[PDB]
Amino acid sequence: PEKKWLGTPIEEMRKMPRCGIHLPSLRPSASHTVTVRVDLLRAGEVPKPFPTHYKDLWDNKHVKMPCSEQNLYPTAGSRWELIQTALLNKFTRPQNLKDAILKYNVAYSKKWDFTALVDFWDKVLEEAEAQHLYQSILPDMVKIALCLPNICTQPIPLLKQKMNHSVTMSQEQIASLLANAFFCTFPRRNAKMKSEYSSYPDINFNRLFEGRSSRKPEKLKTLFCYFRRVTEKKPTGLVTFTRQSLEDFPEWERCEKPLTRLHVTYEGTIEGNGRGMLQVDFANRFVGGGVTGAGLVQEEIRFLINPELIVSRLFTEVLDHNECLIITGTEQYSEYTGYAETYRWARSHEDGSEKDDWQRRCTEIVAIDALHFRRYLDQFVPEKVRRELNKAYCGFLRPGVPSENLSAVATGNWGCGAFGGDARLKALIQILAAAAAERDVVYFTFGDSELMRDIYSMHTFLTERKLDVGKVYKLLLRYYNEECRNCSTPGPDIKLYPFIYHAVESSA
């Protein structure tokens, strides 16, 4: 029988907090928006907002806040005043919640279906659970939502394409923002022919309430677990959201960097067994994918069990080819079983992760989007090999951080299966990108033991024969030119790994 794991023992890999740099003092800069008082930041205490009182920016460089005095509705009145009046009502039946949300979303009264919300409230939840939802949870959520201007006093910049910028806010600030997202209060984020925000993911939660899918009740359970936790016991930590956009990449053909360590296994999970490691989110270029709609695979699941990730959709413009989003400090509030149609909320999770010197949990997640390959051979074209190498490299590289202070990358089959990526090519691409960024690799194959063995065997071969990144890249070019370029069938007769073995064994 196959071994459960191969390569370097996982305990020898680097992880946070042990491997981490000594952090300088947290402070605002041109590259770093910080929305809390760093001088009074203390372990186990809710951070204070900075500035002390609300400041509004209503412009194309910042989030358009629901509490803005420029948020107007039909003479021209205050939409925030209307939101307060709508939400400060007793909820006893799901229609009451629908009617509240639609008071300040009149244009969508016909377009937004609330069937899933109604079924969740009336049929899925037991009577006692329903009562708790409308008697405590929903009112408590309204309270933190309407406190937005007192909690989020600082304008939140949009993380636009090409920006290298970080935003660090408190988990409490995120809770208030996400409660607003639940009640669908964010202006200009709803229209299908919207202009300014057409390049941003959805933030308002309206699509969680629609339709008859059995998935919706599980999403609502997972999110209500979160909202219950944060309203009963306010979170005290911070979270950093960092957009990274690289213009320059390794000259892959000539790269002399050696391959790094590999641990590869067909058991375990990125979030469970990659604790303290750089955890890859197999992203959509709109970060979070269909979390607030119909999607429920790797990304969306992560965005539901660590829901502070969802707030990134408020201010993160769609990723370009050379970009990623890095999120440090999100907390796990839920446990789940299954996947996609079998996904179920299992129970609450009590996150026991340590926090760094900026009070961020030692959980780092990077959203990198693979290309979708609707024609299989396209991914072996050198330009597309380089696109994926560069995307992964952007996700892994940390400018100005010594290699010894970098955790292993915890990843797996990125953009494979129905997205069209070849697992064996994609594994080698990530290994090369990690090598270029001088990080080790922990690779989860999710039940595919043959794939685990093949990845380990290839890494071992390449490592023992001392082929550096450039040598392996040149072998990929050889495969393209010799077996793919002139291939009249959907796939070549000889596979990549066999081709590499024979290429090297027939060489000098």
Author numbering: 442 to 515, 524 to 957
What did the study's authors say about this model?
We purified and crystallized the recombinant mouse PARG catalytic domain (residues 439–959) and determined the unliganded structure of mPARG(439–959) using Se-Met SAD method at 2.0 Å resolution. A nine-strand mixed β sheet is sandwiched by two helical domains. The N-terminal helical domain has nine α helices, whereas the C-terminal helical domain has five. The core structure of the mPARG catalytic domain also has an ADPr-binding macrodomain fold, despite missing the first β strand of the macrodomain. Tyr788, a residue previously identified to be important for the recognition of the PARG inhibitor ADP-HPD, is located at the tip residue in this β hairpin pointing into the cleft. The very N-terminal segment of the mPARG catalytic domain contains the sixteen-residue putative mitochondrial targeting sequence (MTS, residues 454–469, MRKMPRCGIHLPSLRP) and binds to a groove on the side opposite to the active site. In our mPARG structures, this MTS together with residues preceding it, has an extended conformation and wraps along the back side of the PARG catalytic domain. The MTS docks in a hydrophobic groove on the back side of the β sheet, which is the opposite side from the active site. Hydrophobic residues Met454, Met457, Leu464 and Leu467 on the MTS pack tightly with this hydrophobic groove. With the first crystal form that we solved mPARG structure (space P1), both methods failed, since the active site cleft is close to another copy of the mPARG molecule in the crystal lattice.
Reversal of PARylation is predominantly carried out by poly(ADP-ribose) glycohydrolase (PARG) in nucleus and cytosol, whereas ADP-ribosylhydrolase 3 (ARH3) may play a role in mitochondrial PAR degradation. PARG comprises an N-terminal regulatory/targeting domain and a C-terminal catalytic domain. The mouse PARG catalytic domain has a bean-shaped structure, with the active site in a deep cleft in the middle on the abdominal side.
